[PDB]
Design a protein around this ligand. Sequence first.
Ligand code: ERZ
Length: 344
Amino acid sequence: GAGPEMVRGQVFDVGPRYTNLSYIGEGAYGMVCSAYDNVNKVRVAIKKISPFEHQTYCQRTLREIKILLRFRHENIIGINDIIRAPTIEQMKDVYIVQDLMETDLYKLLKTQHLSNDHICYFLYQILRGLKYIHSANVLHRDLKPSNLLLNTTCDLKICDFGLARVADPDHDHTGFLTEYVATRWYRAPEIMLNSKGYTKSIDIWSVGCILAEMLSNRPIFPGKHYLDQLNHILGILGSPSQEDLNCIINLKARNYLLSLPHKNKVPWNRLFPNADSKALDLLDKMLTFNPHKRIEVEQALAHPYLEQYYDPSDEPIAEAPFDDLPKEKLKELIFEETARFQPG
Ligand SMILES: Cc1cnc(Nc2cnn(C)c2C)nc1
């Protein structure tokens, strides 16, 4: 006989297939470990999910499961296996089995200086992954260094699709200071002004912020609270032009911007004196105030900075485009979506 494996006073019950566990880290509702896969004879990553108590955990779990099982791309993390009980009644936790990566960009940026060739390659793979996501009419909505995994040879995979949504550009408008879910430092200016984050331009902003942080090892706009985030953006971009204010029809939002003193643009090359001039030209185009003028993913890939990698024939798209449900229907939905990994 035998008993289930334990990590730090936690059931991490993945055996007999997955053994020899090491703690990696965690989040709000999951411990993450590596484990030796006895079938494929490789170490893998396993994330323990326990979402059946909160309906926002269930929504987020299901959304990501569905997206990652549909998606297939070298720059997007997949799901290799899902472990759960054979019945709904006995199902308490779900384990998601994924390729084991060495680290993430957040950890790498706190410890390592990136050469220009590393920055270039990382940015290429982010955008290549993002082209596929956007081609499926999906928005990631939470791109940040900790959601970018790296292997030992610096190949990059996008993870964490829990906040992802289908794009909805005609329902993007909202009022001033609308509360938002995604990570503050990577939030586009429009979120704080008049946007629900339903357009592809929201992810490009986040990629711009990540590019800036790769250049200096420091987040470019570290806001300490909701409206501070906009202070930081305007601090570097300067005051919006008359033309860009004219696109902001909502009066509360517009008049807030008109109330502020004039701020000068901080030149990119002053902020980043050792950066490649082409990297700073692309940065400028991704961190454009006005989301309609902001560069799109496919244009970013065609930018001179990425000419060593750019190859649209090797940058694939999705074959096709990709609520009020209680906890019990969401549990049934999660059970159903994970059925393909069961023995029999
Ligand atoms: C899904 C997933 C999550 N994490 C990893 N690896 C990782 C990240 N940080 N560290 C220290 C390690 C070992 N691999 C895959």
